[PDB]
């Protein structure tokens, strides 16, 4: 009678930790959700084969609205697992589900997995230098989210990097590309004119982290906004003040313009 | 011709990903470094038995200085694995190793694993709300670092949470406890008088992240400074402004005082 939150990792079924796999193999029921992120290198069938269990996929509504009516009842009499892409508690609201579990008298444990939040280290940007993070959300009809613009501005004033999670509408198979994110940001810039995100802004794009051959690119918006970074998922980063070692890596590994090596002090 | 940077994860030998383990098992040579961080819940022997390959441990100098003299020459003609605690490249110096590999004409790939940066999500605090991060280091001789104090100040001023890594005597396997960190912070507060860290400051302690039985506690410094949080490692977090779900999680899961529920959003 327990509930395991288990992360599946960044890209494919092998991104789960050994700990996660062995525990999942011992569970009576295995649930999962694939709406918080996209695992571009695998399929539900491959994950099921690896774990050797049939997986019950839940929709956002199943979870947010009925987690305690679908999953918790079973966890009271069986060992249950709830799988999620990346790390289960990063850039999701699944942490709140641990409260529902507790109040239902169900013990829960968390098994971590690689997350895009730390995988950004592969960009060469100092991870301790990132400030507040935000999500570039899809406009919805007349509704046009812009709060993430203010996040970049706040971090930039402090010389900190900004990690921009890109939106995803799994049920509509909508996965925001770094290009779309840049386009939206430029539109927000035209509205706010804060001089935060322009054609001359240096950005970093990381696509399909977790794969052996992810796309890591750095350059000015005007040059990357029309570049093909490959299939999603994508994350966008707006660096703050670059240190020489960060610039060196972006140039050597991400093909950034050599001119960024000449940092401004 | 290939060099694999493989992360070992948070706590023990099972924290490596399936992908990382399977790749390591296929390598001709396997190196490991335990000077940037440590695997508190395991030993070199257990990691070695899990992979089934002999593992050669490298010192700080072996890597920082002679990486190209020890590892790269072998990577030129063989498949080589370089194991590191946590997630590869989260450690700042590791990024340049990829450049050295490139310079030496050796291909390198990164196999991610869980890192504290993403694992702190288990504290129930929103990952988006974390600001700049810092490390609390042992004062030694005529060196008493205090910059981490200013990081907290700047983050808190913006309502952001502050992730504080605690110092470690890598070679000696000696860890700074959350208790010692609180002591130091209270001392820095005395010589800073910024009202940033006091007996009434709410803090969160995360012990042994990655283990199946981590300790997660939250409360005011005055009440937690002398509490036993169990074996290391310990991570300290100074929350900024909480929203109600973060507060509820801390109360329900971390045993925080009900007082914190009067959030200030
Ligand atoms: N492997 C990956 N590569 C690049 N971006 C990724 C990624 N994983 C997810 N993302 C980005 O982040 C969004 C999901 S946010 C939730 C992520 C997950 N909990 C984790 O720990 O990784 C996606 O819409 C995408 O923009």
UniProtKB/Swiss-Prot annotation, chains A, B:
It holds the Pfam family TP_methylase. Its EC number is 2.1.1.98. S-adenosyl-L-methionine binds at residues 10, 87, 90, 115-116, 166, 209, 234. One of its GO terms (molecular function) is diphthine synthase activity. SUPFAM superfamilies: Tetrapyrrole methylase. One of its GO terms (biological process) is methylation. InterPro entries: 4pyrrol_Mease (IPR000878), 4pyrrol_Methylase_sf (IPR035996), 4pyrrole_Mease_sub1 (IPR014777), 4pyrrole_Mease_sub2 (IPR014776), Dphthn_synthase (IPR004551). It is an enzyme of class 2 (transferase). It catalyses: 2-[(3S)-amino-3-carboxypropyl]-L-histidyl-[translation elongation factor 2] + 3 S-adenosyl-L-methionine = diphthine-[translation elongation factor 2] + 3 S-adenosyl-L-homocysteine + 3 H(+). Pathway: Protein modification; peptidyl-diphthamide biosynthesis. PANTHER family: DIPHTHINE METHYL ESTER SYNTHASE (PTHR10882:SF0), DIPHTHINE SYNTHASE (PTHR10882). Homodimer. HAMAP family: Diphthine_synth. NCBIfam families: dph5. Belongs to the diphthine synthase family. S-adenosyl-L-methionine-dependent methyltransferase that catalyzes the trimethylation of the amino group of the modified target histidine residue in translation elongation factor 2 (EF-2), to form an intermediate called diphthine. The three successive methylation reactions represent the second step of diphthamide biosynthesis. The diphthine intermediate is not stable in vitro and readily eliminates the trimethylamino group. It is not known whether the elimination reaction also occurs physiologically. This is Diphthine synthase. It comes from Pyrococcus horikoshii (strain ATCC 700860 / DSM 12428 / JCM 9974 / NBRC 100139 / OT-3). The gene is dphB.
